[PDB]
């Protein structure tokens, strides 16, 4: 029917300002006038998804691929539901399908990484992230995620090189600086991690995990009083943390050993400028 359309075009009229309830109804209206328009069942799925309901989004994604099984846009948003639900297993294969029909699509590829990254099988996540950048090398998010899927493998020298770029593309990401630090802190480097953790806090100073990794930097250096200060902050921020305490206790009672190292050394130095000669 062509009256369906006036309804569908009511659904999409609301879609494109919000009230997805309204769109659900007007779709559900249109769907009775023509339960053979994919664009209706699709955009029915596309409402339900957007609110939070996915089981029903899948139902009304399957039934829209019964009609037209010939659009990535249908397969792409189809894999998501699952990803966004949890079942990455499936989202993948469902994705691949959309990459057979519509290969050249950063968003399709990227998410495949996101899928494989999320599966724990990073080796393979790289491949797709590569493709995604290869098509579209302006997605800050890829270089981040890529720098991420090297970090987890153990190639920091690589993962630094990749974060590096991301930072260029979007220097406006707090939760990037933190890894860029962490990358340094894993190897034999603890200074640059501070210059960079410092930044992460310049951007988001109510991130505690930063304040605490920043603390960590100084304990490996041995500035324990300054380290504490950063764990101090990170405790007002997370009072229930388990090892908020243990670590902060370790930090206090570290300094201890130091001051007493100063003592016993200063008091060996007072038993050999008058009970020894030169050597
Ligand atoms: Ca494998």
DSSP letter at 222 equals: T
Cα gap 178→136, rounded to integer Å: 25
Distance 124 CA to ligand 1 centre (A): 7
Which sequence spans correspond to the domains of the chain?
A: 172-279
> What are the structure tokens assigned to 112, written together?
């495949």
Cα gap 53→251, rounded to integer Å: 47
Distance 126 CA to ligand 1 centre (A): 12
Resolution value in angstroms: 2.9
Distance 75 CA to ligand 1 centre (A): 24
Q: How far is CA 84 from CA 11, 50, 107, 124, 251, in A?
A: 24, 11, 15, 20, 41
Distance 261 CA to ligand 1 centre (A): 52
Q: What superfamily in CATH does domain 172-279 come from?
A: Tetratricopeptide repeat domain (1.25.40.10)
Distance 122 CA to ligand 1 centre (A): 9
Dihedrals phi, psi of 71, to nearest 5 degrees: -165, 125
Distance 23 CA to ligand 1 centre (A): 43
Cα gap 132→140, rounded to integer Å: 11
Distance 121 CA to ligand 1 centre (A): 7
Q: Kindly report the CA angle at 59 between 55 and 65, in degrees rounded to 5? A: 135
Dihedrals phi, psi of 191, to nearest 5 degrees: -90, -50
Cα–chain-centroid distance for residue 3? 45
- Please name which of 178, 170, 172, 216 lies closest in space to residue 197, comparing C-alpha atoms: 178
Q: Is 18 left (phi over 0), alpha (psi -120 to 50) or beta?
A: left
Axis crossing angle, helix 208-221 with helix 224-236, rounded to the nearest 10? 160
């Amino acid at each position: 029917m062509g009256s369906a359309e006036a309804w569908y075009n009511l659904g999409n009229a609301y879609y494109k300002q919000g009230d997805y309830l309204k769109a659900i109804e007007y779709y559900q209206k249109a769907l009775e006038l023509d339960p053979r328009s994919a664009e209706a069942w699709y955009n029915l799925g596309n409402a339900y998804y957007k609110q939070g309901d996915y089981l029903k989004a899948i139902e009304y994604y399957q039934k829209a691929l019964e009609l037209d099984p010939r659009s990535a846009e249908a397969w792409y948003n189809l894999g998501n539901a699952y990803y966004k639900q949890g079942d990455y297993d499936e989202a993948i294969e469902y994705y691949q399908k959309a990459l057979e029909l519509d290969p050249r699509s950063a968003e399709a590829w990227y998410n495949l990484g996101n899928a494989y990254y999320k599966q724990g099988d990073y080796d393979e996540a790289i491949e797709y992230y590569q493709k995604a950048l290869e098509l579209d090398p302006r997605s800050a998010e890829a270089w981040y995620n890529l720098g991420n899927a090297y970090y987890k493998q153990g190639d920091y020298d690589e993962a630094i090189e990749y974060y590096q770029k991301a930072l260029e593309l979007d220097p406006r990401s707090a939760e990037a600086w933190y890894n860029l630090g962490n990358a340094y802190y894993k190897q034999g480097d603890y200074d640059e991690a501070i210059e960079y953790y410092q930044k992460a806090l310049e951007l988001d100073p109510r991130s505690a995990e930063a304040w605490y990794n920043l603390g960590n930097a100084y304990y490996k250096q041995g500035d324990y009083l300054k380290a504490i200060e950063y764990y101090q902050k990170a405790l007002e921020l997370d009072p229930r943390s388990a090892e908020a305490w243990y670590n902060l206790g370790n930090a206090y009672y570290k300094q201890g050993d130091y001051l007493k190292a100063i003592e016993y050394y200063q008091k060996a130095l007072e038993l050999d400028p008058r009970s020894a000669e030169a050597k």
